[PDB]
Design a binder for this molecule. Structure first.
Ligand SMILES: Nc1ncnc2c1ncn2[C@@H]1O[C@H](CSCC[C@H](N)C(=O)O)[C@@H](O)[C@H]1O
Ligand SMILES: [Cl-]
Length: 249
């Protein structure tokens, strides 16, 4: 059955936002986009639906979120009900690879799942096919906050290689090379990374307590031990993250 690996489910079951941005930043982003009521938002890799739900509440948007996780999709639906916006935003459990909406969106988004389109360029291209005239593309993507000196530092940041990400100005320039204007941006800070990573540790510890005999208990235990050090040594110092608003030239 279509689903993400269990480790992700286990570590992120208590996350509203599956990315290194705070709720305050997500709100800021929504306001920065100057969205009129009834604007349609398509969100590929929509997580637990926080973006769609909170923006439906605060801006009166409508839309669709597609996510491969069975758990996070259920959570998205619950969230929509909790906030009184279940009639405004819909959540589909599915693979977003190659997903093109016939219903074109004023905002077409992929916030932190750019592998869906095979990377930044491919994801932008995919979202462009669902974009209504005059609309905005949202891309959430890491960047090098500082240049990692070695491949060991790149890998400690959970990148395959140093070339996986760009420095901020090089990333912005790459959007221009693809034929897009950068029209807005909200970047994570280290406190946002702290929210995203540190919350996993508590979730893991409680999960271990409640599931001592699970097959994954050993792997979760090992990760809980090493993650705080790895995070603070590598990710927190070297890895940036942001959401970039783009409009085709
Ligand atoms: N092929 C695919 N299609 C749809 N969702 C996918 C996917 N591959 C991974 N995902 C989902 O992409 C998400 C990456 S985390 C980012 C989620 C969301 N934008 C947020 O800010 O919270 C996970 O929820 C995972 O379930
Ligand atoms: Cl629209």
């Amino acid at each position: 059955m279509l689903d993400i690996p269990r480790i992700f489910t286990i570590t992120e079951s208590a996350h509203r936002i599956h990315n290194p941005i705070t709720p305050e930043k997500l709100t800021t982003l929504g306001a920065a986009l100057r969205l009129e009521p009834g604007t349609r938002v398509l969100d590929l890799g929509s997580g637990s639906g926080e973006m769609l739900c909170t923006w439906a509440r605060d801006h009166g948007i409508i839309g669709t979120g597609i996510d491969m996780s069975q758990l996070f999709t259920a959570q998205a639906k619950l969230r929509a009900e909790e906030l009184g916006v279940a009639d405004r935003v819909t959540f589909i459990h599915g693979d977003a690879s190659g997903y093109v909406s016939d219903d074109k969106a004023g905002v077409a988004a992929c916030v932190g799942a750019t592998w869906i389109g095979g990377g930044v360029a491919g994801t932008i291209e995919l979202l462009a096919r669902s974009l209504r005239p005059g609309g905005i593309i949202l891309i959430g993507e890491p960047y090098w906050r500082q240049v990692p000196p070695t491949e060991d530092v790149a890998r400690g940041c959970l990148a395959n290689s140093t070339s996986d990400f760009l420095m901020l100005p090089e990333l912005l320039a790459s959007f221009g090379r693809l034929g897009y204007d950068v029209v807005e941006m909200v970047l994570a800070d280290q406190d946002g990374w702290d929210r995203y990573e540190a919350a996993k540790w508590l979730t893991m510890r409680r999960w271990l307590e409640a599931n001592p005999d699970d097959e994954l208990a050993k792997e979760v235990r090992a990760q809980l031990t090493s993650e705080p050090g790895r995070y603070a040594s590598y990710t927190r110092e070297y890895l940036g993250w942001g959401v970039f608003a783009l409009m085709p030239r």
